[PDB]
Design a protein around this ligand. Structure first.
Ligand SMILES: O=C(CSc1nnc[nH]1)Nc1ccc([C@]23C[C@H]4C[C@H](C[C@H](C4)C2)C3)cc1
Length: 193
């Protein structure tokens, strides 16, 4: 369960269309030390270090993906939900070799549905950098080469209460490549210290 009392992730996927092909997908708990991965994110400000210091720790998660790169419109879809009416700020930092190369900030207001509030950020066009990176990563002859390249590639997703500036969720994404026989997969972890 990737979430807290105030906010949970319902679904998340990154895909390409001409049906959809999902490179990664979450639809709806072990632990990992944050110390392990200060290096793969920015550090001197707004880093994983600074954010985890502020807390709360229970809002910090790690997701390892094994992506399916064997298959247009390149999109990302995400959905959150909560019991409180809120307006969310969703920040996404793509990092290469610890350095931020993309920051994407989006806003989504609560939508009342079935006795709860949903937050649907759907078919958001995948940024030009990742589309370009993806088509290159595709070219590689071996999976072990893809994994070598990917071990210096991470994403940091921060979801804050726009109105109260409070952190609701912080997710760290790291990536490997799966085979065709073994579909896309994910393993969600809890960040601790
Ligand atoms: O994390 C987010 C939030 S959305 C966004 N921010 N900028 C653009 N889009 N999206 C996300 C996630 C994962 C992937 C990728 C990364 C590797 C592995 C696999 C195939 C491709 C290469 C693409 C999954 C792209 C995007």
């Amino acid at each position: 369960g990737l979430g807290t009392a105030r906010l949970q992730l319902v679904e998340f996927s990154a895909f390409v269309e001409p049906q959809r092909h999902l490179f990664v997908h979450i639809s709806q708990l072990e632990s990992v030390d944050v110390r392990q991965i200060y290096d793969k994110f920015p550090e001197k400000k707004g880093g994983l270090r600074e954010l985890y210091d502020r807390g709360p720790p229970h809002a910090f998660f790690l997701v390892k993906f094994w992506a399916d790169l064997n298959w247009g419109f390149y999109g990302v879809s995400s959905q959150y939900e909560s019991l409180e009416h809120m307006t969310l700020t969703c920040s996404s930092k793509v990092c290469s070799f610890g350095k931020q190369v993309v920051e994407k900030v989006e806003t989504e207001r609560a939508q009342l549905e079935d006795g709860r509030f949903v937050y649907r950020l759907l078919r958001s066009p995948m940024c030009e950098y990742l589309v370009n990176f993806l088509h290159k990563l595709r070219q590689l002859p071996e999976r072990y080469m893809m994994n070598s390249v990917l071990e210096n590639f991470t994403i940091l997703q921060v979801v804050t209460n726009r109105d109260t500036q409070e952190l609701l969720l912080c997710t760290a994404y790291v990536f490997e490549v799966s085979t065709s026989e073994r579909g896309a997969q994910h393993h969600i972890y809890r960040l601790v210290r």
